[PDB]
């Protein structure tokens, strides 16, 4: 299917408690493969998936150098943001960065991404053209002007269309046993009376990869979106994900309800009911 690579940076100031912490993580699809943490005893880019371990010392040294340089850059950007927002040096603030590429089954670029946030709010983003910017406020417009003058978008475009896609293709081949394997959900429906009048039907999906899934309840063939409780998809810790969806139903009406499951690992969507 289609695939993505993403890097995520978080830079967090902590006045009075040293310099800002910088943490970076890299993902292919829903699989983390690298991390860097400036608070580690010996900071380095480190492997977090088996298929990246085969990269040689030049790779790891280059990634570590880049993360250390990025940490220094984002410590400076935290100071700059204080100025742009007229903020005191006493508070703690956070910059977040995301970037990466999406490719189709043919490995061709579908689109690239690069977005920035300050204190959890959009700051600036590279547009889909990989050539212009959208700034969220008058502070980010200062950054935009600086980045237009320095033709920063051209450097992002060159990475996103070049090295980003080329490395993603390499990782997908080296990790094909896992990155190119979808694990379908294991599904079942549970029933719990709430009172003499009503019961909960809960439709479960366990053990699936990747995380994207759709679980829906229908009553008499009509989706019950407003009456369904849907938990956030959650990691099991073994690469796979879990999710459930529940509805409260009148006792004796249970067979009017069907749970529908869509997942990339299923050749056809599943329909399930409570089996008493």
């Amino acid at each position: 299917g289609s695939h993505s690579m993403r890097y995520f940076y978080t830079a967090m100031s902590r006045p009075g408690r040293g310099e800002p912490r910088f943490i970076a993580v890299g993902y292919v699809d829903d699989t983390q493969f690298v991390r860097f943490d400036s608070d580690a005893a010996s900071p380095r880019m480190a492997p977090r998936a088996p298929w990246i371990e085969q990269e040689g010392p030049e790779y790891w040294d280059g990634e570590t150098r880049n993360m250390k340089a990025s940490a220094q850059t984002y410590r400076e950007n935290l100071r700059i943001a204080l100025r742009y927002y007229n903020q005191s040096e006493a508070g703690s603030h956070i910059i977040q960065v995301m970037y990466g590429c999406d490719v189709g089954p043919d490995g061709r670029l579908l689109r690239g991404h690069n977005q920035y946030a300050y204190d959890g709010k959009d700051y600036i983003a590279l547009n889909e053209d990989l050539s212009s910017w959208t700034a969220a406020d008058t502070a980010a417009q200062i950054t935009q002007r600086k980045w237009e003058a320095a033709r920063v978008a051209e450097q992002l475009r060159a990475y996103l269309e070049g090295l980003c896609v080329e490395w993603l293709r390499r990782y997908l081949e080296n990790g094909k046993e896992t990155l190119q394997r979808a694990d379908p959900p294991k599904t079942h429906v549970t029933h719990h009376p709430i009172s003499d009048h009503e019961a909960t039907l809960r439709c479960w999906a366990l053990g699936f990869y990747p995380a994207e899934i759709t679980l829906t309840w229908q009553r008499d063939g009509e989706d019950q979106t407003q009456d369904t409780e849907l938990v956030e998809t959650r990691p099991a810790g073994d690469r796979t994900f879990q999710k459930w969806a529940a509805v409260v139903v009148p006792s004796g009406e249970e067979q009017r309800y069907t749970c529908h499951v869509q997942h990339e690992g299923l050749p056809k969507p599943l329909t399930l009911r409570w089996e008493p």
């Binding site: 890097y7 970076a24 890299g26 880019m45 790779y59 280059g62 990634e63 880049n66 993360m67 340089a69 990025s70 850059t73 400076e76 950007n77 700059i80 943001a81 742009y84 970037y99 950054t143 600086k146 980045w147 320095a150 920063v152 450097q155 992002l156 990475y159 090295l163 980003c164 490395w167």
Partner: peptide, 10 residues
């Protein structure tokens, strides 16, 4: 591999 973007500040 990560993006190398030298000498770019906010």
């Amino acid at each position: 591999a990560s993006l190398n973007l030298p000498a770019v500040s906010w």
